[PDB]
Amino acid sequence: GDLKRSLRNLEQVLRLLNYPEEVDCVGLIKGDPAASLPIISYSFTSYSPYVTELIMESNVENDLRFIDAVYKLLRDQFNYKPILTKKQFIQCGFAEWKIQIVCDILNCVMKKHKELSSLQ
C-alpha cells in the first residue's frame, strides 16, 4: 500500500481513458467506495461501444447490487479477480488497494476494447 503510487497510477489510467468527470480525491484517499463506483461505472457504460455492448447484454444494475455485478462481470468477461473481496470493497479502508482495483478494471476495459475492435 503506497497511496502516492496508486494515485499516480490512477491519474495515468484516467488520462488514457479520457475520463471527463471530476474525481472525488478525498473519497479515494479514505477508501470510500462512493469515489470508485462512478469511475468504474463510466468505463462500463461510456468508454467503448464494444465493451458496453458486451456488458449490457448480460446483467442490469443503490449500488449494493452494483458491486456484485461488477465482480461477476470482471470474472466472466475480463478474467479479472479483484484483490479485495466484495465486502472488503464495500467497507471503508484498504484505500490504496481500491484505487489500484479501479486502475485494473479500467485497464481491462481498454484492453478489451482494443481486442474487440480488432476482430471487427
Numbering used by the authors: 4 to 64, 69 to 127
Please share text taken word for word from the publication where this structure appeared.
CEP192 and CEP44 are proteins with a key role in centrosome and centriole biogenesis. We have recently determined the structures of the N-terminal Calponin Homology (CH) domain of human CEP44 and the so-called Spd2 domain of human CEP192. Both structures were obtained through X-ray crystallography at a resolution of 2.3 and 2.1 Å, respectively, and were experimentally phased.
CEP44 was recently identified as a luminal centriolar protein that binds to the A-microtubules (MTs) of centrioles, as well as to the inner centriole protein POC1B20. The crystal structure of the CEP44 CH domain showed a typical CH fold consisting of a central four helical bundle elaborated with three short helices. The comparison of the experimental with the AF2 predicted structure (AF-Q9C0F1-F1-model_v1) revealed 116 residues superposed with rmsd of 0.74 Å. Thus, the AF2-predicted model is more similar to the experimental structure than any of the homologous templates available in the PDB. The predicted AF2 model has very similar or nearly identical backbone and side-chain conformations and is of comparable quality to the experimental crystal structure. The CEP44 CH-domain structure revealed the presence of a highly conserved basic patch on its surface. Mutation of the residues that constitute this patch abolish the CEP44 microtubule and centriole association, rationalising their involvement in microtubule binding. Even in the absence of the experimental CH-domain structure, the AF2 prediction model of this quality could be successfully used in cryo-EM-based microtubule docking studies or for further mutagenesis design aimed at the identification of additional CEP44 interaction partners. Besides the accurate prediction of the CEP44 N-terminal domain, the AF2 prediction of the alternating coiled coil and unstructured regions that follow the CH domain is in good agreement with other prediction methods and provides an easily accessible model of CEP44’s overall domain organisation.
